């Protein structure tokens, strides 16, 4: 009924086997390895605590709770998307990506570079074609 998870930095969280199983990654291990302190070298204690929280909330499972849940700085959100991916939790990988999707909506390409801090690989002539290639829309 219980399983212990080990963050890439020391912490051990005891989650319900059924909730931990929500992670395909953590699931394959608890089987193809039958380990107790499940080694999670790619997720630190902060993010994992979040993953477990999100999975607990949806143990039976954008909602308001999720929105408040993902109401964190870009860094944490970037860490969760990775975590969710690494732990392969389709559920939480879906909301986090849509959250980032909602962030892009409205903002212009410039406002987007600002936020997510993205280098403009473009040439004013390339943005000229990218634009032309998208006029029809």
């Amino acid at each position: 009924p219980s399983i212990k998870l080990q963050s890439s930095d020391g912490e051990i969280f005891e989650v319900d086997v059924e909730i931990a199983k929500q992670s395909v990654t953590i699931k394959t291990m608890l089987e193809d390895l039958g380990m107790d302190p499940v080694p999670l070298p790619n997720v630190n204690a902060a993010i994992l605590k979040k993953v477990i929280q999100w999975c607990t909330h949806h143990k039976d499972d954008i909602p308001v709770w999720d929105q408040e849940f993902l109401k964190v700085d870009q860094g944490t959100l970037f860490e969760l998307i990775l975590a969710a991916n690494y732990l392969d939790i389709k559920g939480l990988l879906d909301v986090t990506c849509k959250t980032v999707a909602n962030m892009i909506k409205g903002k212009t390409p410039e406002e987007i570079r600002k936020t997510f801090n993205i280098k403009n690989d473009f040439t004013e002539e390339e943005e000229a074609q990218v634009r032309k290639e998208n006029q029809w829309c």
Binding site: G75, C97, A101, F116
Partner: protein
């Protein structure tokens, strides 16, 4: 912190959460996003209906590995007969659009992997019809109302599509007896749904025989508006042991009473005989054949990309993820 440090698989996730206009926005953020914003995973199903469009946009978009392309009632009337590179497009609906014949050709000349195509209400041409022959894997083809092609180009197309299941080749106002003859003489024996309505004096009984002889697997057979057909055709429908849907609407030479004989076809589930059956003898006909569904439906569903209202973008069941609605 920067997100450009995010895995390629994840940006695609985020991008999959964006609607068409949003996706084209992001494509202009950085060169990376631009590459990814056109990733094949993002463009499988595209719905651009009633959109006026330049052939280069349709080509450049079809060149991104697009499988289901819904585009009825659209407008493509300019140069550059797509030659872009071969297209993955499998399911495509260009019905009732206005497309320069050379633009129609250019796009279909980059298609070989089509499974379901609709060119309903489109002026075509042998060059066009012949390029369609490439799509031998065609399962459903709709050329209803099309014109501009010979019975010879039609012949190589039908000869070539040997696994065709549904074929709506009705009301090609463009053609003669020969087209009808070619039609029944070369439709694949694999055919199960055929709509050849609209050819009055050009569809003889003998053409019905040929069809019946070569195609025993017909489940749907629409012969509406077959002015020549008399009840003495019924002996041909009897030789189809899987026919469960027949249409003879507007076949004025079929005496309403003789319709009782269609009770011989055991598998028959529905009969459509509009415009030749008096309301009275029609309700008596329904009395006699309680197993049938008479004049229950007005429109053909044979090889139709979509059937319904508010139910658009279900191009042969596919709910196009990218649209402009």
């Amino acid at each position: 912190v920067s997100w450009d440090s995010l895995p390629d698989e994840l940006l695609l996730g985020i991008f999959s959460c964006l609607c068409l206009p949003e996706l084209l926005k992001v494509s202009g953020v950085c060169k990376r996003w631009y590459r990814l914003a056109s990733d094949e995973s993002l463009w499988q199903t595209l719905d651009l209906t009633g959109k006026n469009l330049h052939p280069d946009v349709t080509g450049r978009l079809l060149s991104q590995g697009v499988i289901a392309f819904r585009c009825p009632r659209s407008f493509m009337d300019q140069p550059l007969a797509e030659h872009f590179s071969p297209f993955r497009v499998q399911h495509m609906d260009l019905s009732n659009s206005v497309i320069e014949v050379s633009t129609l050709h250019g796009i279909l000349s980059q298609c070989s992997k089509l499974q379901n195509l609709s060119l309903e209400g489109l002026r075509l041409s042998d060059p066009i019809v012949n390029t369609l022959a490439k799509n031998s894997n065609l399962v459903r083809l709709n050329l209803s109302g099309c014109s501009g092609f010979s019975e010879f180009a039609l012949q190589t197309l039908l000869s070539s599509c040997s696994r065709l299941d549904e074929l709506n080749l009705s009301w090609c106002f463009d053609f003669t007896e020969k087209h009808v003859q070619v039609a029944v003489a070369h439709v694949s024996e694999t055919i199960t749904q055929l709509n050849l309505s609209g050819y009055r004096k050009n569809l003889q009984k003998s053409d019905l025989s040929t069809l019946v002889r070569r195609c025993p697997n017909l489940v749907h057979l629409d012969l509406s508006d077959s002015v020549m057909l008399k009840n003495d055709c019924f002996q041909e429908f009897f030789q189809l042991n899987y026919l469960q849907h027949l249409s003879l609407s507007r076949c004025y030479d079929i005496i309403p009473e003789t319709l009782l004989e269609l009770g011989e076809i055991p598998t028959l589930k529905t009969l459509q005989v509009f415009g030749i059956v008096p309301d009275g003898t029609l309700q008596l006909l329904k009395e006699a054949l309680p197993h049938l569904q008479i004049n229950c439906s007005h429109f053909t569903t044979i090889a139709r990309p979509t059937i319904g209202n508010k139910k658009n973008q279900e191009i042969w069941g596919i709910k196009c993820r990218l649209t402009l609605q």
